[PDB]
């Protein structure tokens, strides 16, 4: 009906009330509030961890739950992130050994998108990130290609707008999830260098900057 | 001639005075302590920074200057282990990206045996483990397999010593240098599962146990 909710199965949220175009996915377990905005057998809804608004098909209502405790965003210091890194890169590796296809809104896994990657690792240690590549850069610190170190995030796109997103590893290389038409169809490790392959190549040409993770995201109110 | 020297180029280091069987891989700039014991036209040297002992070709006598600042090992709280087991997977990351191969007492890369890429992960952020699998084991704190997290090592041999190593990145998978008769011939991973295809169903029944990094070696009185 109307409040937060958690999730019982992971559930697909839509950009549009025609639900035609996968905006993200929602983990089971996570909280959403659901709007009284109806249109189309779907509903208006946000996610609680990260703020993200999509619609919801009325037929997933038996996957929601309400929820008895509230989500509370956990705090996290600089320190505490640097010490989970190891694990958020291990988390895409994990991603990486498993069959996989890029999704696009893909999130849960094992298909994602490069936004959908980040998020997902971080989350699996319980760290916050905005859903998008261009709200990600936002929310990171910038630093200049040359500060980048392990779990740092590189961010590629046009002079206006991030739209790629990639966890940097070591000496020039990163792991992504890259799309059919210029990238792998998946998961894969890429160098931010003219010295690469081809797909790299294409990437390292779209470089915008980059940016360190020195928060969780704490929700708006509300 | 006798004491504690830098060296200017990578320097193999073997088993006997023969020089048949690489032992390690000295990379530049690490410190090595030279003994009067000449034999076979090499000597008997052992390594500062783990104490590992070996004999060097006398030929690479011009690849040695005199140390004027004596090695003397940081010190790293578990908490500072933490913060860089980021880079010491990404380390590892980076080496499978390159082309390589097993190497018998591979230290110095791009060629790697299993407990030589340990070493050299955990030493590109400064963190010194002993040069041997066994050693490995006897230097870490032993866990186990339950409690593996990303950047513990896994042991696996006989039921009386050590004999190969890996890094644990998460899901029951983990990173090594593996042989060209039971392996993959260089870097890879594989997963400590029934479930796993044939080389890690046959590292898996060789698996001991697990250890973790809890402090960086201190060279003994000396
Ligand atoms: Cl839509
Ligand atoms: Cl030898
Ligand atoms: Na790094
Ligand atoms: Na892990």
């Given at each position: 009906k109307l409040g937060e909710y958690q999730?019982?199965?992971?559930?697909?949220l839509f950009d549009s009330p025609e639900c035609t175009r996968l905006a993200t996915q929602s983990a089971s377990g996570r909280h959403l509030w659901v709007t009284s905005n109806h249109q189309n057998l779907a509903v208006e809804v946000?996610?609680?961890e990260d703020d993200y608004p999509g619609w919801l098909s009325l037929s997933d209502f038996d996957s929601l739950q309400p929820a008895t405790?509230?989500?509370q965003a956990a705090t996290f210091s600089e320190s505490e992130i640097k010490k989970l890194l190891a694990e958020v890169i291990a988390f895409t590796q994990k991603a990486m050994q498993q069959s996989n296809y890029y999704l696009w809104g893909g999130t849960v896994g094992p298909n994602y998108d490069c936004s959908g990657l980040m998020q997902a690792a971080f989350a699996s240690v319980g760290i916050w990130l905005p859903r998008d590549a261009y709200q990600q850069e936002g929310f990171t610190q910038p630093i200049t290609i040359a500060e980048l170190v392990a779990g740092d995030l590189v961010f590629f796109g046009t002079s206006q707008k991030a739209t790629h997103v990639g966890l940097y590893l070591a000496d020039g290389y990163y792991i992504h999830s890259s799309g059919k038409d210029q990238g792998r169809d998946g998961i894969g490790i890429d160098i931010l260098s003219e010295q690469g392959d081809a797909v790299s190549l294409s990437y390292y040409q779209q470089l915008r900057g980059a940016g360190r993770v020195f928060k969780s995201y704490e929700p708006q109110r509300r």
């Open positions: 999730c019982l199965a992971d559930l697909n946000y996610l609680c405790v509230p989500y």
